[PDB]
Design an enzyme around this catalytic site. Sequence first.
Site, PDB file in Angstrom:
ATOM      1  N   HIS E   8       0.811  -1.229  -0.145  1.00 43.97           N
ATOM      2  CA  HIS E   8       0.165   0.117  -0.004  1.00 43.97           C
ATOM      3  C   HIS E   8       0.585   1.137   0.001  1.00 43.97           C
ATOM      4  CE1 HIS E   8      -3.223   2.977   0.352  1.00 43.97           C
ATOM      5  NE2 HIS E   8      -4.123   1.937   0.346  1.00 43.97           N
ATOM      6  N   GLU E  80       0.511   1.600   7.998  1.00 42.79           N
ATOM      7  CA  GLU E  80       1.907   1.095   7.398  1.00 42.79           C
ATOM      8  C   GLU E  80       3.030   1.540   8.318  1.00 42.79           C
ATOM      9  OE1 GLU E  80       4.065  -0.382   4.160  1.00 42.79           O
ATOM     10  OE2 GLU E  80       3.423  -1.402   6.058  1.00 42.79           O
ATOM     11  N   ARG E 168     -18.145  32.834   6.174  1.00 48.64           N
ATOM     12  CA  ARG E 168     -18.342  33.881   5.139  1.00 48.64           C
ATOM     13  C   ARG E 168     -17.592  33.090   3.744  1.00 48.64           C
ATOM     14  NH1 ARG E 168     -15.921  38.591   4.716  1.00 48.64           N
ATOM     15  NH2 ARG E 168     -17.641  39.971   5.090  1.00 48.64           N
ATOM     16  N   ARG E 223     -11.090  33.844  12.046  1.00 48.97           N
ATOM     17  CA  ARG E 223     -12.535  34.259  11.418  1.00 48.97           C
ATOM     18  C   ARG E 223     -13.073  35.250  12.384  1.00 48.97           C
ATOM     19  NH1 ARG E 223     -17.954  35.157  11.451  1.00 48.97           N
ATOM     20  NH2 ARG E 223     -18.561  33.168  12.552  1.00 48.97           N
TER      21      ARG E 223
END
Lengths: 253, 253, 253, 253, 253, 253
Positions: E8, E80, E168, E223
């Site tokens: 993988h 892994e 926003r 923010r």
Amino acid sequence: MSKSDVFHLGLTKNDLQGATLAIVPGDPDRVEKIAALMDKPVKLASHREFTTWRAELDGKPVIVCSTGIGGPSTSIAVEELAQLGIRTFLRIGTTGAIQPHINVGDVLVTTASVRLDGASLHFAPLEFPAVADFECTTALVEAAKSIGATTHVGVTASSDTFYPGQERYDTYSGRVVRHFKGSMEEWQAMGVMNYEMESATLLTMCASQGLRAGMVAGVIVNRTQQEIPNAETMKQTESHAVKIVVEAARRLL
Amino acid sequence: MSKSDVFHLGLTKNDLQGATLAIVPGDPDRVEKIAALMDKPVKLASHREFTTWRAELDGKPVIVCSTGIGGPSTSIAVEELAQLGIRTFLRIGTTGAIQPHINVGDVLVTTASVRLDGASLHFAPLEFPAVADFECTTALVEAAKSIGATTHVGVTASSDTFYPGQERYDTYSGRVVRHFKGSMEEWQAMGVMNYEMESATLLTMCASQGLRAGMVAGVIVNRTQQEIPNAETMKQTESHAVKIVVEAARRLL
Amino acid sequence: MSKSDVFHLGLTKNDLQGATLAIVPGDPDRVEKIAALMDKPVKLASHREFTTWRAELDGKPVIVCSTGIGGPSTSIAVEELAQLGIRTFLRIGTTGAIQPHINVGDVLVTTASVRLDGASLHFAPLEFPAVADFECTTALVEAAKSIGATTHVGVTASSDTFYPGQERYDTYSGRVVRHFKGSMEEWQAMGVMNYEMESATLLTMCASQGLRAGMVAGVIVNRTQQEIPNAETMKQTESHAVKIVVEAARRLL
Amino acid sequence: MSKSDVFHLGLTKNDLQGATLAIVPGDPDRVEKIAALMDKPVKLASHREFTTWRAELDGKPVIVCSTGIGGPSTSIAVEELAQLGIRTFLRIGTTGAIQPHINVGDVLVTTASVRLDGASLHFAPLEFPAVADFECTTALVEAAKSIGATTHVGVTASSDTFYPGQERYDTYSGRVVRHFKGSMEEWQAMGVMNYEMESATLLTMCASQGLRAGMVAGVIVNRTQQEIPNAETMKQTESHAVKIVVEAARRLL
Amino acid sequence: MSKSDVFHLGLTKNDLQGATLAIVPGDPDRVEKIAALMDKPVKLASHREFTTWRAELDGKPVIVCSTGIGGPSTSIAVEELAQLGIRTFLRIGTTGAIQPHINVGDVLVTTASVRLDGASLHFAPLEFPAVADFECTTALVEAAKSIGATTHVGVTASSDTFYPGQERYDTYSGRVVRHFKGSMEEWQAMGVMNYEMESATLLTMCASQGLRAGMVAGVIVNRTQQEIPNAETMKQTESHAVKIVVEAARRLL
Amino acid sequence: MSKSDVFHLGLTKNDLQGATLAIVPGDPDRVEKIAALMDKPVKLASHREFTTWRAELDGKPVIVCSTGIGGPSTSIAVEELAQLGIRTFLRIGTTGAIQPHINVGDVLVTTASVRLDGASLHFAPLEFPAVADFECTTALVEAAKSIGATTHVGVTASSDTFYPGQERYDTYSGRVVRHFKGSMEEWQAMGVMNYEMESATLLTMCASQGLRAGMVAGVIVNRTQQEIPNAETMKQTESHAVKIVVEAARRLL
């Protein structure tokens, strides 16, 4: 059904003075015991399961209270304490352990708990973690080094009933256990150190506002070794875990 | 003897002398008020939150144990009395109603509870019903009609938290209880008669063998018609219920 | 446009004529046999699986209208009846008891049901209990006792499907039985007496207010043997639960 | 204890006479209108909501059994049928679409169904797709095209009771549900076609091995428009969709 | 590269040599920038999404690896690696604060995350806390001290997708769930500082015998207020953040 | 990268030309490879696995982009693509089957997915089916059966794990698996054929929005039948599943 303000505990805001710190064990016949290892400890009230005592710790006051059994008893003692002026909750109990390498007598410092209660869900939903404060877990883990107790830091499972799943526990049955039977070896594998019943609510309340909460225990029992522990050993466990949280506190005040 | 691991109640099978039926109140203060109307009241070995007495009712030893606050403790005691020998259980307590047709002084007997809590789930899935027992319930209505007190038979709702939400009761707003942003006008329109914290837990744990559990309460308050609680209503109301539970208790022997 | 967006099962207006009770069996082919037991039994209307007859007791009108299979039909029937004005319901069917000591030619009375349907949740959350009305439930107990019958009373598990779990029944398989795999042994061991399909709906959608509902049941079989069934006496138990259902309504009128 | 619990009102294998497909309507009358269309239609029996006819189609036998109301009875049908031997099931009914662009007299194909019911949960978890079969569906669409109907291939909302919308329709309410109302522009914003009562269940009982379950409905109303009625159009939609199903069905077996 | 049993996209048990500690940032660039503040930086294999570099800190083998995006990739990176012997896992990121009191430049260390992801549930029940190991969390803050950067240790929200609630932003007009749509304003009133998508998974594993894990993330943008940032400085935010993790890795070899 | 105001990993319509279709595989390597089969295949961009080629096929510019691992990388390199006007997606990859009657090297067609992932839930509730668009889906089977490729149409379990349920999957291990214990055999008996990580988030997202989504893949592994592989497969199946995706988008344009 109207009311007028509140009722419970016994405290008056002015009593505890400007304490700010609070040590909340469960058992009420243990509140005087902790307050003794301090200076000038006084009885403030004893309104059914909720037993308050004050003391000073190096010129600075600290409130030792009592909570009761279950999340509901705790969430009351805490709701009213936090309004009285407290912004730090240190808990000391004496649990049993689900991990073989954990021996009776050792200390447990709970970074966070597996929520298996229903009161905590009134503060913050089953997605928010029941996590202990950082300065609180620090003080307690380092204060346990200055006592010489093989401390164990990790995860504690706090249930709403006397700890389900397998385990052994001479579990009263016939109609086994519900959707909680194989839950004991599961947590056990997930590095969960002990079971217990009040932190889910303690930690999650705190976590979700102000906070500074932390739990310290003492393995008075382990679900595997026989005779564990001989009475003298059991109680000797209950003491060190008090020197550590009274000491933890001296490091937070 | 017992020492670590379980223990809990200061009790042994021997100390019950049959019993099979135990009336279980809230505060331990109330238990002895009940243990009055009966013969040969022996106070049994108390402990934290859980008291236990024994007495004569028509020459049959019956027993009275306090359970503490909410379900976690409620479950512990049940879990422990059952073992000892107690099969049948009746709970008494004074609550307030949410239906403006239940005036303070009215005797609410419960047949089924709205499972709105966590300890119940250790004993049954959310789906199973938490219902009183046929024989027990009947007797409470029969007794109640014999002293001509305004019995009301119906459903009760068990919160696992100190009557919070948004019907001005203590826990705290801001967050509230998420998945139930609607409750008071929604438990009302369903015919729920009053709110409490151990009801669900007890009915669910019982309809499993001990299937012998009823519950009667005394309306001490009521928000919907808030005003009527005049003078010491609490007197007649708290006493009416204690005559009923002991009367019912005698029919079931 | 609404071509009378309702145009549903049954009559309309004052064909009932003051009736406020209604025995609602599941089969239409039994609405006849029942009303025949009353006085002056006139047929009122008919729709598929919906037959209504008007008969009378001690001078009072009592309707007997059949509801059909499962809960989505039951819902409709009820919603119609109470709309027309009936306020009390009496169901009676026949079941297959899951407990060994029950046995054939026995009447089971349901205190409440274990909700495994879906239509009930269109009325109440999974917390609201599926409970039988008191008055209604009692009458069936006083009717049966006074008819020469063995009446077992308690809990029924209402399944939206012809009972899953893990018992004797054949079944085509496919995936076999999903996460209902051990539900048999569970409820069996939790003390449910048998399975039905329309109880949880009826009960829950009445228990609110304007409840007044109960359920009678003849045991045609047991799911725990290797002996009977009786053969000719099986229907003979139908003609047993019916005098009882007829008795209960005379007592609720 | 050879308790023949085998056939909950129905037939024998030879009755089926080697049938493998089965168009399952909803009512007895639409069975006979369907089996009118096939060769040599025989009434095999009729018991409760279940009226079974035997027909032919290209010399091949086609079972036509009536489901009844909602998924409860339907599940007995598919399970009784399959047991006797059906491997492929086609459902057909009439419906009112909720999508603005979806006109009346507009057939709709259902590739998948939105749960909202309760009996499917008896077969596969809420997670599992209650999905139409691949073949049975193209056959359906391949029929709608050959008949000339504007087919609207898509998904359908299947809740076994009332459709949670404070609507212009009709809401019998005193007290209803817990946490629902998202059936308005909600399921419609997710571009869902109609409201079923039997699909989620049929689809899920089939998709779980031994599938072959397709469904087609004839649109008789459109909740977002008033201009109607039109006498036979519904009977013509009744006619529209019935041909599509018999014709589709031929392609399958 | 596939091979027998598994391949993988990763490396070998040897390329790591010492293995043990790994620093896991998101983007593969960052990797090259982190190992550069260490000696003997060797490149190993950038086999898709996860790019692994090896270097040596204070004279021992150290490894940097990119996790990917979100919990499923975070989860393939951690599996892994753990298989090859990595015990400790540190996370360095850059974030956005929803706390009005955490301006840019700040550093946020994470104690426990709110499990609003799908990736964690594959590891523990929903009740499980995804909390960071005490060691890496103490090391983190101590490291973040030797540099002098203002740190905040706390609760981070972890979901899927970019910042949920209502910001926003550009809520693309194609589905978004209302069951999460309003909680950002809830999580702030819950005291959670920032959002992320990889923590909940990272933490819930590791915590489960996956050994150790802890996270540090600098504040590049808040923010809550507009005036910030001085979009020139930011280079150095990641800078000190990248220096901090090195210091913390050093304290853990 | 991304940007201060919503802008994120991608490009602009200004260089998309004719939007509508997108072939979205896993790797960034695959893009070019599948692109090396269209017409005038130019490279357009490349970030964290988000490589993009704007190839042509029979006149239409059929963009091939990439998603990466999991629903979160997908959702971005899907939802932003949608904003550029790509209202039809075809998913291609590789996969490991679970039915014992599936040989390594035969394409599978996902009609719908079991929702074992966490991102999907942001697009539609669990009950709404992760269903694939009949149009895309039809072309897919047309194509495979067109070239004899052994197509299987069915459901696909979509996990945010790495194909759960377990078996000798090896891994670090310790705690077996959560509630995905035997989850695989439960899916087998329930007919599900393969596992996967992003058909869930994709089918669901596109299914409740603009619409149209497809899903094909190749089988290089059978997680039962040990005898890897069919000849040597791997690199041959890449070709047999990719052909189908061009042959198949060449019907949607």
